[PDB]
Amino acid sequence: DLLAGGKDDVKATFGADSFVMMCIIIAELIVGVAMYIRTKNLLILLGLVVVIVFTTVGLTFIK
Amino acid sequence: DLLAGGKDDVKATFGADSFVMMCIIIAELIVGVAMYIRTKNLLILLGLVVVIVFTTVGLTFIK
Amino acid sequence: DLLAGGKDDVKATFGADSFVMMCIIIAELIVGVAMYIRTKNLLILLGLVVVIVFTTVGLTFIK
Amino acid sequence: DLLAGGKDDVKATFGADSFVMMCIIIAELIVGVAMYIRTKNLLILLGLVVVIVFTTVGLTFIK
Amino acid sequence: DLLAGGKDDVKATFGADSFVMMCIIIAELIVGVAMYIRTKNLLILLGLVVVIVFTTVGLTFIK
Amino acid sequence: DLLAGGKDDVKATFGADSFVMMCIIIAELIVGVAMYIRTKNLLILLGLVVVIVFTTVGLTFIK
Amino acid sequence: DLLAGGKDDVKATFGADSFVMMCIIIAELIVGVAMYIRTKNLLILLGLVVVIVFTTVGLTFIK
Amino acid sequence: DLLAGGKDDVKATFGADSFVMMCIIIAELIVGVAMYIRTKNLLILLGLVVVIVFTTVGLTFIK
Amino acid sequence: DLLAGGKDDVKATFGADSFVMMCIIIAELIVGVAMYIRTKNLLILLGLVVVIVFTTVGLTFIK
Amino acid sequence: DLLAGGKDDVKATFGADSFVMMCIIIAELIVGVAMYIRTKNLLILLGLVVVIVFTTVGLTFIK
Amino acid sequence: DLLAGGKDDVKATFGADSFVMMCIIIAELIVGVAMYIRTKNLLILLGLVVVIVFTTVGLTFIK
Amino acid sequence: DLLAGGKDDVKATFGADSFVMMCIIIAELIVGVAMYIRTKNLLILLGLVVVIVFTTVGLTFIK
Amino acid sequence: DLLAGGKDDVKATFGADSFVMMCIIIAELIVGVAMYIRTKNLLILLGLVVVIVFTTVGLTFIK
Amino acid sequence: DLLAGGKDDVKATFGADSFVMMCIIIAELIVGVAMYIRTKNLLILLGLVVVIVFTTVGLTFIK
Amino acid sequence: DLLAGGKDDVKATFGADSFVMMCIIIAELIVGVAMYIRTKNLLILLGLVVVIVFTTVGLTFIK
Amino acid sequence: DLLAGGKDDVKATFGADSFVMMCIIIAELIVGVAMYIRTKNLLILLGLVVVIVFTTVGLTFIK
Amino acid sequence: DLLAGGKDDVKATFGADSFVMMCIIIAELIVGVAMYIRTKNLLILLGLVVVIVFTTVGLTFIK
Amino acid sequence: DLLAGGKDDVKATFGADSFVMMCIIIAELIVGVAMYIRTKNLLILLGLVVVIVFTTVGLTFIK
Amino acid sequence: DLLAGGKDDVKATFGADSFVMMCIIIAELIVGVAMYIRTKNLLILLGLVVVIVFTTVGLTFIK
Ligand SMILES: CCCCCCCCCCCCCCCC(=O)OC[C@H](COP(=O)(O)OC[C@@H](O)CO)OC(=O)CCCCCCCCCCCCCCC
Ligand SMILES: CCCCCCCCCCCCCCCC(=O)OC[C@H](COP(=O)(O)OC[C@@H](O)CO)OC(=O)CCCCCCCCCCCCCCC
Ligand SMILES: CCCCCCCCCCCCCCCC(=O)OC[C@H](COP(=O)(O)OC[C@@H](O)CO)OC(=O)CCCCCCCCCCCCCCC
Ligand SMILES: CCCCCCCCCCCCCCCC(=O)OC[C@H](COP(=O)(O)OC[C@@H](O)CO)OC(=O)CCCCCCCCCCCCCCC
Ligand SMILES: CCCCCCCCCCCCCCCC(=O)OC[C@H](COP(=O)(O)OC[C@@H](O)CO)OC(=O)CCCCCCCCCCCCCCC
Ligand SMILES: CCCCCCCCCCCCCCCC(=O)OC[C@H](COP(=O)(O)OC[C@@H](O)CO)OC(=O)CCCCCCCCCCCCCCC
Ligand SMILES: CCCCCCCCCCCCCCCC(=O)OC[C@H](COP(=O)(O)OC[C@@H](O)CO)OC(=O)CCCCCCCCCCCCCCC
Ligand SMILES: CCCCCCCCCCCCCCCC(=O)OC[C@H](COP(=O)(O)OC[C@@H](O)CO)OC(=O)CCCCCCCCCCCCCCC
Ligand SMILES: CCCCCCCCCCCCCCCC(=O)OC[C@H](COP(=O)(O)OC[C@@H](O)CO)OC(=O)CCCCCCCCCCCCCCC
Ligand SMILES: CCCCCCCCCCCCCCCC(=O)OC[C@H](COP(=O)(O)OC[C@@H](O)CO)OC(=O)CCCCCCCCCCCCCCC
Ligand SMILES: CCCCCCCCCCCCCCCC(=O)OC[C@H](COP(=O)(O)OC[C@@H](O)CO)OC(=O)CCCCCCCCCCCCCCC
Ligand SMILES: CCCCCCCCCCCCCCCC(=O)OC[C@H](COP(=O)(O)OC[C@@H](O)CO)OC(=O)CCCCCCCCCCCCCCC
Ligand SMILES: CCCCCCCCCCCCCCCC(=O)OC[C@H](COP(=O)(O)OC[C@@H](O)CO)OC(=O)CCCCCCCCCCCCCCC
Fold first, then answer.
1. O3 CB under 6 A from ligand 12?
2. Do chains K and M meet with 3 or more Cβ pairs nearer than 8 Å?
3. C-alpha to C-alpha distance for J45 and J55, rounded to whole angstroms
4. E31 Cβ closer than 6 Å to some ligand 4 atom
5. Which of A2, B36, H39, M8 is the most exposed place for a label (fewest CB within 10 A)?
């Protein structure tokens, strides 16, 4: 059988609605605008979108 | 269940009416005019508009 | 609630009647005449007008 | 309140009777005659007039 | 399904009655007259018409 | 077999009716008119058409 | 004989119909249009074609 | 005489048809397209060819 | 075999009855009359005829 | 012997009846008429003919 | 004596009838027509000829 | 006397007819045509000639 | 002695009976008639003669 | 004394009867006729003569 | 006294009759004709003369 | 008193007539002509003069 | 209370009449003329003025 | 009080009659004539005058 | 006092009777005739006179 195996709730800690998933997404926003202002090209504002989908489709592979 | 999960008020710190959202928007204005004067083309004054909408529609994805 | 949230007076520093808003407008004038003399076409003298309105209608979005 | 806000005398430096306003107007004269002699059409001598009024009505917007 | 998908109101920001659609059309007018006066041929005054229709029939392709 | 293979819905995120496909097409419009006004030649207004078809026939190759 | 030799299904992970081959092709599309709009020359829209064939004829060399 | 000398099958592990020779070639493909998209010059797609021949003519020197 | 090869409907987009073929012919009319009025010689009104036949016999070479 | 040598079908992709050979010929038509209308001299309509023959006699040198 | 000296078949890989010699010649054709259409002068169509002879008389110096 | 002094055949490895002298010359050809196509000026095709003579007159200084 | 020195057949490529010498002479004819029709003076039809002799007596200086 | 000093035969490579001196003279011919046809003035056909003498009297200064 | 001071023969290596002084002068010739053909103005053929005298009167300052 | 103070002859090593002062001046000549040929403007040939005087009036400050 | 708080005379070291304020202003002059001569546009001579006022109004904020 | 404050004689080094003020003025002369000869317009000879006055009225601000 | 202050003889190097003042005047002559022949208007032959006086009255300001 499995040991240490536990709980999982660790998943709920890092999961969909979380504190860490909430700060990791807000940093993408705030330094996304930063690296935009210093440059002014737009692929970087789109760089926020790839974090939205990545975390979303990423978290479903945890199970 | 969730841990560390907290408060959120961190959202209120970086949210709609905030100090950091107030300075990140005012820098777009002041270096927007800068890179305009050194060049004098207008897509850059419009570069302020894309920060208005980006932060606005961005903050609603935090939840 | 909000943290760091402060004062604002930072707004009064960069606001309507300010030192930085006073120098950023005077540079538009002095390099506006410059790029005019080296060329002598008039859309550039009008380039001062777009800084007048931009800062004016820009500062009202800070709030 | 305001910070950095200062003095203004910076205005007196770039203002009506100044050193920089005195040289920026004298360059209009000397390269105005230049681009006239190489061509000999008169709208360019009139190009000095638009610098007279522009700086005059421009400086009053600083305040 | 779709993510990030949002709102749209971004469309209302750049749409038919807007601030940016209002300034992008007024620049066509003011530099249209400019490039007319320096030349005096009329296809350029007609250059304003092609911006009227282009934005109009353009915005309907957004959906 | 395949791993990581997933979902696809990533396709629905960047697909036909999307948020990113909606902004990438609206930028073609707004800087299309820009580079038109500064020049006034028409192949550039047609530059919007090639983005319409390119994204359309492009997205069908994703599968 | 061979060791570690395995499975292959790793091939099916990166192969013809895949998740990674699906995202690597969609990035060519979205930054292809980007570098087009900022420039407006067409060899770049054709830059999508060379990724179609390259991955296609590339994957057949894996075996 | 020779000691430790063994088997060789280690050669079959890293040889022509292998697992490691299969992944080392597939990385050339996937980061070849990457460094292409971020740049769009073609010598890099040809960078896959030099890995094909190098491993091929390289493995024959093992003996 | 062929890749990327597609659809064609791109042909229907630029083909006989189209939007772009409709605007490219109407510009010949409107600037044809222009360059006529400023001059008043008639080979230019005939310049519309050569666009009629050119697009007609041109489109049949696409296949 | 030869390596990487492949398929060719790459030839069929860029060959006689193709998608890229179909768009590269249709651009000659549409910007041929453009540079004609802005000028109205006819060697440019003949510029379409030299693309017909060039691609035709060019493709036969690929082999 | 010589080491590493090998095979040559590397020559057959890059030689007369090859895959890389087939793509390097087809790019000359497709961007030759490109830089022609954007300009319409003919020395560039002749630019394909100098690649024909250069590779031909070049490959004979390999030995 | 001399030590380590050996053989030379290392000279035969890098000498006139060699594998490395064969690949170092073929790269000059293939990236010579590359940097030609992206530009179309001819001093670069002549850049192959200076590698022919340089290696030739260079190798004779080894002794 | 000489290096790179080759073949010549490059001479036969650009020589008397050639493909490039055949197209360079036919362009003189077709744009000779063009610039004649738009003007109707005859020194230009004679402009074809000077290309006949120039290439003829020119090619003999190659050796 | 002198080092590296060599051979000269490098002189024979670029000298009187050479491959590079043969192509550098044939380009003068072929783009000489080009820039003639697009213009039809004759000093340019004479531009071939100045290359004949220049290379001739130039090569004698090498020694 | 002096150290390292040597020989000079380094002077004879780069001096009047040398290998490097022979190639540095022949490059002036071959790219002199190049930049002439692409332009056809004559100050550039005279650009060879200034290299003749410069190296001549330059080398005498070495001592 | 002074220690380590020595000899000077180090001065004679780097002084007026030296080996290092002889090579540092000859490099100015040889890369002076280089950067001239690639450009053909003359301030650079004069760049040799400023090294003549600089070393001359420089060495007298050593004492 | 305050510690380390000292003297100030550090202010007198970097203050109005100082050694460092005297060299920092003289460098603006000497490299101001430099970047002027290499270019010859005049906003740079005015670059000395902005250092005059900046240090002046800057030093008053130290207190 | 002040420290490091010194001497000034640094002023006498860069002052009115100096070595560096003597070379910085002579470069304006020699590259002034250069950029004149390559162009032949006269505002540039006047560019020497603005260095005369600038250094003169500049040095008086050092104190 | 002054440092670095030297000699002047640098003045004698660039002064009235000099090598550099001798070549800078002879270039005015030789490219003066050039730009005359290609045009045949006479203000340019007079362009030599303005170099005579400019260097003459210029050198007297060095002191
Ligand atoms: C778990 C699945 C992982 C799949 C990830 C796929 C990555 C494959 C890489 C493709 C080519 C690399 C392009 C280099 C990047 C490149 O060349 O562009 C560079 C660009 C930012 O520009 P830079 O500031 O780096 O400056 C470079 C510029 O000069 C070039 O325009 O990258 C971005 O961040 C913009 C993103 C927009 C592009 C969107 C593509 C769609 C992405 C979707 C994948 C979502 C992941 C979900 C997974 C959970
Ligand atoms: C979260 C959603 C993210 C979506 C972001 C969409 C980005 C897709 C990129 C499209 C093509 C890139 C064009 C390159 C940019 C380009 O070529 O123009 C360049 C231009 C500035 O010009 P530069 O100084 O860089 O000089 C280049 C010039 O020579 C070209 O005119 O960019 C700007 O900053 C002007 C912005 C006006 C254009 C407005 C477009 C509408 C934007 C709306 C999106 C709002 C985001 C909201 C998200 C919260
Ligand atoms: C916050 C709101 C942002 C909205 C900004 C709107 C920008 C949209 C761009 C429209 C087309 C771009 C034209 C390119 C510019 C162009 O083609 O002209 C070029 C012209 C200067 O000429 P250049 O020296 O660049 O040389 C180019 C010339 O050859 C063309 O005549 O631009 C100027 O600086 C003159 C401005 C007069 C035009 C006034 C327009 C009215 C503006 C009002 C917006 C005020 C902003 C307030 C926001 C706070
Ligand atoms: C702060 C307020 C800014 C408002 C500025 C107004 C600019 C609007 C542009 C109007 C049409 C542009 C005409 C192009 C210019 C054009 O086509 O003429 C060109 C002409 C010089 O000729 P060029 O050497 O460029 O050669 C072109 C010739 O072939 C055409 O005759 O421009 C001048 O410098 C002459 C100025 C006389 C014209 C006086 C007009 C009255 C001006 C008053 C504004 C004073 C500003 C005060 C602000 C402080
Ligand atoms: C989304 C759909 C895009 C379709 C765009 C169609 C563009 C096809 C180009 C046709 C030939 C190009 C002519 C070159 C232009 C040319 O030769 O004229 C040049 C002329 C301006 O003259 P310039 O100052 O450039 O000087 C050139 C003069 O010497 C020639 O008279 O262009 C204009 O801006 C005037 C526009 C009047 C012509 C109106 C035509 C009707 C247009 C309707 C399309 C509306 C677009 C709606 C889309 C939303
Ligand atoms: C996926 C399939 C990819 C195929 C792409 C085909 C590209 C082949 C390039 C042909 C010659 C290049 C011409 C250079 C461009 C050139 O010379 O014109 C230049 C012109 C813009 O003018 P510029 O501002 O660059 O100034 C240059 C001017 O002086 C020349 O008139 O380009 C445009 O953006 C106008 C587009 C109208 C032309 C429409 C052509 C039809 C296109 C259809 C393809 C749709 C793609 C769908 C794929 C999803
Ligand atoms: C795809 C096939 C391409 C074939 C194109 C044939 C072009 C050969 C050029 C012949 C001589 C050039 C004459 C210069 C032009 C010239 O000298 O006239 C000049 C004239 C316009 O006059 P401009 O305003 O340029 O001022 C010049 C005047 O002073 C001279 O009268 O050109 C026109 O646009 C009028 C067209 C009427 C002439 C009709 C001819 C029949 C054309 C039929 C071809 C249809 C093409 C179909 C292809 C799809
Ligand atoms: C692979 C084989 C390559 C051979 C290519 C041959 C190119 C040799 C250049 C000859 C002289 C250059 C003339 C400059 C061009 C010149 O002076 O005319 C200029 C003319 C266009 O006029 P522009 O708008 O450039 O304005 C210039 C005018 O003022 C002069 O009338 O060029 C064209 O595009 C018209 C083409 C009609 C001429 C047809 C000639 C027959 C061509 C056949 C070759 C087919 C290639 C097949 C290869 C696959
Ligand atoms: C291995 C042997 C290497 C020998 C290479 C010889 C190169 C010597 C350079 C001569 C003068 C340079 C002219 C600059 C180029 C120049 O001024 O023309 C420029 C022209 C293209 O025009 P662009 O678009 O650069 O615009 C410039 C125009 O405004 C000038 O018309 O160059 C071409 O690509 C056309 C080629 C036709 C000319 C054919 C010449 C015959 C070539 C034969 C050599 C074959 C090589 C075989 C080797 C394997
Ligand atoms: C062992 C002996 C070493 C001696 C080497 C001699 C190098 C001296 C440098 C002379 C001036 C530098 C010119 C810069 C280069 C320059 O300005 O041209 C630049 C040109 C390539 O053009 P780029 O693409 O760099 O673009 C620059 C262009 O805009 C200028 O046309 O250089 C080449 O690769 C073409 C070579 C043709 C020139 C042939 C010269 C004859 C060479 C013979 C030496 C053979 C070596 C044998 C040794 C084994
Ligand atoms: C390799 C040897 C090079 C030698 C080339 C000799 C060129 C010397 C220039 C003489 C005076 C220039 C006259 C300007 C030209 C001039 O004033 O006429 C202009 C005339 C064309 O008229 P346009 O359209 O330029 O309009 C100008 C008219 O208004 C004047 O009637 O030129 C031609 O193309 C006609 C040619 C007939 C003249 C035939 C002369 C015999 C030529 C024989 C040389 C054959 C070369 C063989 C070499 C391989
Ligand atoms: C090594 C020795 C170097 C000495 C080179 C001498 C160059 C001195 C420049 C004199 C005045 C410049 C004239 C500008 C050129 C100018 O104004 O004419 C321009 C003319 C070509 O006309 P474009 O197409 O540039 O258009 C300009 C026209 O509108 C003017 O008619 O130049 C040529 O290529 C024709 C050459 C015939 C002239 C032959 C002259 C005899 C040359 C003999 C030297 C042989 C060199 C041998 C050295 C190895
Ligand atoms: C060691 C001694 C150094 C003294 C060097 C003297 C350089 C002083 C610069 C004078 C004014 C600069 C003119 C810019 C150059 C300029 O405006 O012309 C430009 C011209 C080449 O024309 P570009 O292709 O750069 O195009 C520009 C054209 O549009 C202008 O006609 O320069 C040359 O290479 C031609 C050389 C003929 C001129 C001969 C002059 C006599 C030179 C004698 C010096 C020999 C040096 C021996 C030293 C060992």
1. no
2. yes
3. 17
4. no
5. A2
